[PDB]
Design a protein around this ligand. Structure first.
Ligand SMILES: Nc1nc2c(ncn2[C@@H]2O[C@H](COP(=O)(O)O)[C@@H](O)[C@H]2O)c(=O)[nH]1
Ligand SMILES: [Mg+2]
Ligand SMILES: [Mg+2]
Ligand SMILES: [Mg+2]
Ligand SMILES: [Mg+2]
Ligand SMILES: [Mg+2]
Ligand SMILES: [Mg+2]
Ligand SMILES: [Mg+2]
Ligand SMILES: [Mg+2]
Ligand SMILES: [Mg+2]
Ligand SMILES: [Mg+2]
Ligand SMILES: [Mg+2]
Ligand SMILES: [Mg+2]
Ligand SMILES: [Mg+2]
Ligand SMILES: [Mg+2]
Ligand SMILES: [Mg+2]
Ligand SMILES: [Mg+2]
Ligand SMILES: [Mg+2]
Ligand SMILES: [Mg+2]
Ligand SMILES: [Mg+2]
Ligand SMILES: [Mg+2]
Ligand SMILES: [Mg+2]
Ligand SMILES: [Mg+2]
Ligand SMILES: [Mg+2]
Ligand SMILES: [Mg+2]
Ligand SMILES: [Mg+2]
Ligand SMILES: [Mg+2]
Ligand SMILES: [Mg+2]
Ligand SMILES: [Mg+2]
Ligand SMILES: [Mg+2]
Ligand SMILES: [Mg+2]
Ligand SMILES: [Mg+2]
Ligand SMILES: [Mg+2]
Ligand SMILES: [Mg+2]
Ligand SMILES: [Mg+2]
Ligand SMILES: [Mg+2]
Ligand SMILES: [Mg+2]
Ligand SMILES: [Mg+2]
Ligand SMILES: [Mg+2]
Lengths: 196, 118, 140, 55, 95, 97, 288, 105
RNA sequence: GAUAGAAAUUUUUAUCCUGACGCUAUAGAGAUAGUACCGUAAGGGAAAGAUGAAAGAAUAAAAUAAAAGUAAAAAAAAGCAAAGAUUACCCCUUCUACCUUUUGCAUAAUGGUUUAACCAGAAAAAAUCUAACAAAGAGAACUUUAGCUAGAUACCCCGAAACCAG
RNA sequence: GCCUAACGAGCCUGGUGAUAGCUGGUUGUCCGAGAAAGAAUUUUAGUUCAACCUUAAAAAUACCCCAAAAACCCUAAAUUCCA
RNA sequence: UCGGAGUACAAAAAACCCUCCGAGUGAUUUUAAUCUAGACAAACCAGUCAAAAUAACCAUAACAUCACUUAUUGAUCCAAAAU
């Protein structure tokens, strides 16, 4: 899952001109015979100095692949499970703070021995309290994301994960749905009998 | 064409003087062969190579004990020009279960039962 | 992503260090050094194999020299020393010849005595006369 | 979908299948995955065995 | 065979193989004996019957035809009153 | 094989900038979001390469089909020549056949 | 149970710095570099193989190819027009009913089977629906109002033994796609079309009471059922005086695709409403 | 190559082993890191069996330096003043023990 | 035959979130430039930069003194130039340069004075391995009588005489 | 013959990275096993099969093989099949 | 291109611009079918045998025969007949 997250979004914008795209090299530099030197065609061959690249990178390359949905869900579940098992997962309530000082969060984390890096997950983007929003807007190692922004890469990147109770319930409901579900006849965005 | 060779039966009919010449009992044939490959199997036909391989004589100058039955005597006849065959002699009898780890095979062919005791 | 070799200096030096003592351009030019170093290593292995043979030949020559100095030939000296159950190899024999002249003369005298006993036994063809130094001692 | 002592499950499976084959069946245990892999088709027999055992 | 088409970029199939061959879903390929309509007045009844009989293909020819054809011709077909539906599957093959 | 004689300026790269901290944050937008959006829509790049992957010939074919009507003259000529060369090489050259 | 979780307590933190794929999952690629993999790089000596100018697959070096010396015979001739019917075993139907995928209390349709995932229909691949086979007729113990396109004689006998109803109907490809995926059709925004009649090759099949055709004379159904029961030695159940007789006798009009719905209606699922045409010409076209 | 390199005759330091045997290893300095993954073997060696080696060999002074280093090293200084510097980069505890015992011998 | 190849019919939700697992002066545009120079013309077409905060700090200051080529420092019987060695450089003993092509090359068959920088294996149909779920698999269209989904494993460079159009 | 120093038909540009069964080249270490040719072919300067060989997987018999057995005018070394 | 004999002496195979015979069909009536085990040979394509069971003739054969009988022959595609 971590490699998939790192790679599917990658588009390499590397391109080198082949011997057919270099400017000149349209004629034989010398006759084939009698000159006493090596035989050559275009002066833009990969052998030559200013010649084109033999293979090189060819245009923008998209390294896009999509892992199976159940595999991705299992990866999320395993990330949460290891976070809980290694005592790096903490459940809070309502994610409220007394003050909007990032130093307050720094002192709280170093007092509770949470770790150098903390990722706070809230239920909804627009419902995050302004105090914690302003506190985490000025911090680098303290990163605040909504529930839909939870992923294995950030879970592994941050030493400590902080979840609210509504976030835990949301994750539980969203992740336990795939264990007893049919295959999609059509994409699940379309109406279903028991699914939005 | 070069093919296998059939050895005539009169080759393997010992003379009365041969028993005394080679130190064999004119009445009772010996029980076990000690076979040691001397020559190489290179520049020899593939059937001879295979017979040497199946006789356990892949390594040279390492004696191997075999039976004195015609079934193996046929193969020994086939590759008799690459091996040295001696009779296995037992002055002290077969090695017992308490003497398995203290035995040795002399170059002259007697398998001693107690070898360098104490 | 363009990748280029940056440790080519050390790659070249690892080969050029084995050719510093050569003659000509083989100690400087890498193209002429790689071929010369490979030949040097192959000759090193072959001469490692041949060193034992060369040293054995040298020891045999020294033993021949000492034995002929004692009025005895090398094959006779060796076979009679073996018959006396004296299992000293050529290296030790040459060491004794160079540094232990009295011991080597004693060994040569023993070998000559064993040769004389063998000749006497062969001439007599008698089982009951046995040489004093012709007796064989079994493992005890 | 094996949770628990997969080694105990392998022991039970080999004990159950030994009389049927006359020899200990060849098995491979994937503990990180939780999978038992027996050499041969014993699917129906193992299904019946698990039904009788209560799974 | 066109491994990469110029329009879709897909893999193409040669139509001669499908015009003169039939593939069972088990992997076997069925074909007609060559020369079964040529000079029948010149051939014995046994030879004519042998020519009329359908025959299979060996592993090399089967793999060749699989390479020439695409995945649309290796699918499972449930035709109405298919003559070869009973032969589509293989039974009692101990390998 | 001459190598530089001075220490290069050590790049002070930080692992906690905005991009590295929010890398791929919505990779599970669908799974955790009551499906409306595929992770395809988060890919930023050329129009003919958003949520798609293929070898060089397929990429060239797709580029010509999608944005070939807006390419420059020499760019379109080079794309056509590359398509022809790739077609010939892939359908007529190789070892495994 | 999961002792790995307790083992993870002693282990250090799981981060991106210590991640390993499964052994053997990724076979390492090998490049033509070095003493072993260089020097013609696995291509061979001169010829066409090392220069990559080999002929095509079917070529045999100038000999007449094997795939060309065989005479052409019709094997796949007209394959794209043969009717295809996905088989549905009575054993599979009983399995679905027992597991609750399909409810016998309601008339079983192709849409219901697709929703229960018992069958998969690909109309673009010339599938014309689902046929019934008798592979599990011995242990079939369900009373359903099945609705298929083709039905085996023994499967019909097995269903009538328990006291169900077997009806074989025809669906043109468009209506078949609509039946298989009704929600995409309802989001398409088009009125429900009429159901095309079967062609002349399939009219005799669907107008005979022996096959329980949907266009067959209903007066000949009891005679066929009695003949079937006498042939297979079972008493014909008193279907008329059953509690679920309405559900067993519910039927689709031969120009009707869904149950209850009619051609020409527009299903606005966003507002949960149905729009019905009222023009005389439109109504005549849709009911004709 | 013998002709390319140097040479020496077999000899002992200060007639070692004649009257008494004196261990020639004088000091052993380990330089490792407390957090680098390449120093894990050295860290385990120091945790487990550096004390046992020190008790077994009382004639050698053992220094341990945890410093921010990328490659862990061991420096063996002998009675001759000879210095032998070895790299213990990414080696098992058994390999570290074998190398240290070889240096001591 | 090589190969070519649709359509009917379906899917596609607005904007910012855009920069770089692209190059760093034989690389990246040919480019310091379509300029010098070469052709009557169409046309072809380059190489060349490196101190420092200050050179309004050149009786100027510090880092490498590391390629081939020379000098410091010409050579002393004998031999693919080296190895075994040795108190000792040679003297002693032993080894028919390297790639390529061939049945076979020290071959007097080809290639190279040397150094530095560039210069040549690329594709996932069937298969193998790993993993997810499993009579079902797949985030839409398909395959399914243990199968479906995903990932990793694979297929070079230079060279004609020629042909066509302007 | 001559048509801007090469004319059995000029030169430049484009097709063009033309095409070569033909020649040359093809860049790290170590380890395991390892091949000299029967048939087609405008084919013998090449390919496609077979026989050998490599990498995995299922099995059970595999070589050596005494009798006995394999043609009729004469016929050697020896073959085939077998416990 | 196909067959026989020697090379190639005794299971099979085995080459030469090696030595000799031949074939590219005739005559006659017994006008010689269907389906299917198991086999020979064979790179492939092709070539060969064949038990049992079926309808008509003795109610006891049908392998067409002879000319050294072995060779007397040509693939797809495509063209024509009446399928
Ligand atoms: N066809 C074939 N060529 C071989 C075989 N063994 C060696 N060669 C060739 O013989 C040459 C090398 O000779 P070698 O080193 O074997 O004496 C190379 O051209 C190699 O391809 C073989 O068994 N079959
Ligand atoms: Mg060009
Ligand atoms: Mg041109
Ligand atoms: Mg050219
Ligand atoms: Mg330039
Ligand atoms: Mg360039
Ligand atoms: Mg040795
Ligand atoms: Mg490879
Ligand atoms: Mg590769
Ligand atoms: Mg190689
Ligand atoms: Mg090479
Ligand atoms: Mg060749
Ligand atoms: Mg070559
Ligand atoms: Mg031809
Ligand atoms: Mg289907
Ligand atoms: Mg043709
Ligand atoms: Mg430039
Ligand atoms: Mg210099
Ligand atoms: Mg000399
Ligand atoms: Mg030679
Ligand atoms: Mg060769
Ligand atoms: Mg020659
Ligand atoms: Mg010569
Ligand atoms: Mg030559
Ligand atoms: Mg030549
Ligand atoms: Mg030469
Ligand atoms: Mg060369
Ligand atoms: Mg030259
Ligand atoms: Mg595949
Ligand atoms: Mg032409
Ligand atoms: Mg001119
Ligand atoms: Mg070319
Ligand atoms: Mg050729
Ligand atoms: Mg080997
Ligand atoms: Mg082959
Ligand atoms: Mg016999
Ligand atoms: Mg046998
Ligand atoms: Mg056979
Ligand atoms: Mg019969």
């Amino acid at each position: 899952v971590a490699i998939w997250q790192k790679n599917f979004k990658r588009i390499s914008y590397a391109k080198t001109k082949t011997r057919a795209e270099v400017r000149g090299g349209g004629r034989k530099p010398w006759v084939q015979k009698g000159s006493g030197r090596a035989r050559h065609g275009s002066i833009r061959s990969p052998i030559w100095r200013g010649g084109g690249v033999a293979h090189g990178p060819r245009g923008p390359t998209s390294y896009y692949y999509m892992l199976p949905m159940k595999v991705r869900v299992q990866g999320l579940k395993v990330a949460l499970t290891v976070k809980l098992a290694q005592d790096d997962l903490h459940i809070v309530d309502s994610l409220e703070l007394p003050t909007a000082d990032p130093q307050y969060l720094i002192e709280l984390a170093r007092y509770r021995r949470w770790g150098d890096s903390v990722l706070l997950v809230d239920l909804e983007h627009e419902d995050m309290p302004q105090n914690v929003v302003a506190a985490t807007s000025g911090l680098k190692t303290f990163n605040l994301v909504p529930a839909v922004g939870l992923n294995v890469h950030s879970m592994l990147k941050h030493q400590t994960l902080v979840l609210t109770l509504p976030t835990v319930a949301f994750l539980e409901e969203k992740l336990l749905w795939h264990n007893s579900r049919y295959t999609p006849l059509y994409p699940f965005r379309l109406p279903y009998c028991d699914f939005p | 064409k070069f093919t296998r060779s059939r050895i005539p039966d009169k080759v393997f009919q010992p003379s009365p003087e041969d028993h005394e010449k080679y130190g064999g009992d004119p009445q009772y044939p010996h029980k076990l062969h000690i076979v040691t490959r001397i020559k190489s199997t290179k520049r020899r036909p593939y059937w001879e190579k295979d017979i040497i391989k199946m006789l356990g004589l892949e390594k040279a100058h390492t004696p191997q004990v075999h039976k004195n039955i015609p079934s193996v005597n046929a193969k020994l006849k086939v590759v008799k020009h690459l091996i040295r065959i001696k009779p296995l002699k037992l002055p002290q009898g077969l090695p017992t279960e308490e003497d398995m780890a203290n035995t040795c095979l002399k170059s002259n062919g007697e398998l001693v039962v107690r070898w360098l005791l104490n | 992503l363009r990748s280029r070799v940056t440790d080519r200096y050390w790659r070249v030096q690892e080969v050029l260090k084995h050719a510093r003592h050569f003659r000509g351009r083989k100690n400087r030019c890498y193209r002429l050094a790689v071929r010369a170093v490979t030949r040097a290593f192959v000759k090193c292995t072959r001469a490692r194999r041949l060193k034992k043979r060369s040293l054995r030949t040298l020891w045999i020559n020294r033993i021949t020299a000492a034995s002929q100095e004692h009025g005895l030939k090398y094959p006779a000296f060796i076979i009679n020393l073996i018959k006396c159950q004296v299992e000293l190899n050529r290296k030790v024999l040459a060491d004794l010849a160079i540094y232990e002249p009295k011991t080597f003369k004693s060994l040569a005298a023993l070998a000559k005595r064993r040769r004389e006993e063998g000749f006497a036994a062969a001439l007599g063809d008698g089982k009951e006369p046995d040489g004093i130094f012709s007796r064989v001692v079994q493992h005890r | 979908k094996v949770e628990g002592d997969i080694w105990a499950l392998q022991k039970d499976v080999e004990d159950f299948l030994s009389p049927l084959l006359g020899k200990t069946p060849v098995t491979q245990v994937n503990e990180v995955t939780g999978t038992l892999r027996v050499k041969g088709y014993f699917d129906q027999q193992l299904k019946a065995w698990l039904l009788e055992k209560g799974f | 065979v066109t491994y990469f088409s110029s329009r879709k970029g897909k893999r193409k199939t040669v139509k001669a193989v499908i015009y003169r061959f039939l593939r069972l879903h088990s992997g076997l390929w069925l074909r007609r004996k060559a020369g079964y309509k040529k000079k029948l007045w010149k051939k014995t009844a046994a030879r004519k019957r042998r020519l009329r009989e359908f025959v299979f293909c060996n592993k090399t020819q089967s793999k060749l035809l699989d390479k020439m054809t695409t995945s649309f011709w290796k699918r499972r077909n449930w035709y109405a009153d298919d003559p070869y539906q009973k032969y589509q599957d293989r039974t009692n093959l101990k390998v | 094989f001459h190598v530089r004689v001075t220490l290069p300026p050590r790049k002070v790269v930080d692992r906690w900038n905005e991009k590295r901290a929010m890398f791929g944050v919505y990779d599970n937008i669908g799974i955790l979001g009551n499906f409306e959006k595929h992770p395809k829509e988060l890919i930023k790049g050329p129009i003919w390469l958003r949520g798609w992957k293929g070898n060089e010939l397929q990429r060239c074919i797709r580029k010509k089909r999608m944005v070939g009507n807006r390419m420059f003259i020499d760019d379109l000529h080079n794309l056509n020549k590359r398509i022809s060369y790739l077609y010939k090489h892939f359908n007529r050259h190789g070892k495994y056949r | 149970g999961p002792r790995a979780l307790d083992l993870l307590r002693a282990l250090p933190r799981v981060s991106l710095a210590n991640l390993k794929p499964n052994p053997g999952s990724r076979k390492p690629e090998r490049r033509p570099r070095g003493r072993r993999r260089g020097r013609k790089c696995g291509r061979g000596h001169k010829g066409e193989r090392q220069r990559g100018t080999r002929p095509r697959l079917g070529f045999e070096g100038g000999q007449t190819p094997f795939y060309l010396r065989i005479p052409k015979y019709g094997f796949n001739e007209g394959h794209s027009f043969r009717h295809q019917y996905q088989p549905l075993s009575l054993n599979r139907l009983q399995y679905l009913i027992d597991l609750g995928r399909v409810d016998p209390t309601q008339p079983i349709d192709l849409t219901q089977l697709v929703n229960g995932r018992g069958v998969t229909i690909q109309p673009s691949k010339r599938d014309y629906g689902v046929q019934l086979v008798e592979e599990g007729a011995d242990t079939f113990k369900a009373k359903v109002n099945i609705e298929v396109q083709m039905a085996s004689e023994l499967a019909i006998a097995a269903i009538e033994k328990n006291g169900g109803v077997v009806t074989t109907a025809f669906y043109d490809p468009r209506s078949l796609e609509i039946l298989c995926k009704p929600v995409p059709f309802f989001l398409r925004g088009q009125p429900i079309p009429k159901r095309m009649l079967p062609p002349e090759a399939l009219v005799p099949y669907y107008t005979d009471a022996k096959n329980r055709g949907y266009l067959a004379d209903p007066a000949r159904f009891p005679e066929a059922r009695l003949e079937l029961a006498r042939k297979y030695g079972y008493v014909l159940p008193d279907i008329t005086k059953d509690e679920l007789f309405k559900m067993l006798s519910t039927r689709k009009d031969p120009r009707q695709i869904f149950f209850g719905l009619a051609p020409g209606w527009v299903v606005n699922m966003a507002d949960k409403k149905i729009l019905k045409p009222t023009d005389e010409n439109l109504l005549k076209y849709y009911s004709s | 190559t013998a002709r390319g390199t140097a040479s020496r005759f077999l000899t002992s330091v200060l007639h070692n082993g004649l009257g008494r045997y004196v261990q020639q290893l004088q000091r052993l300095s380990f330089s490792l890191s407390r957090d680098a993954p390449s120093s894990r073997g050295a860290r385990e060696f120091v945790e487990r069996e550096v004390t046992d080696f020190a008790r077994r060999n009382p004639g050698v002074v053992i220094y341990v330096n945890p410093r921010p280093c990328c490659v862990p090293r061991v420096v063996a200084e002998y009675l001759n003043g000879a210095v032998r510097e070895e790299s213990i980069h990414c080696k098992s505890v058994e390999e570290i023990a074998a190398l240290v015992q070889k240096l001591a011998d």
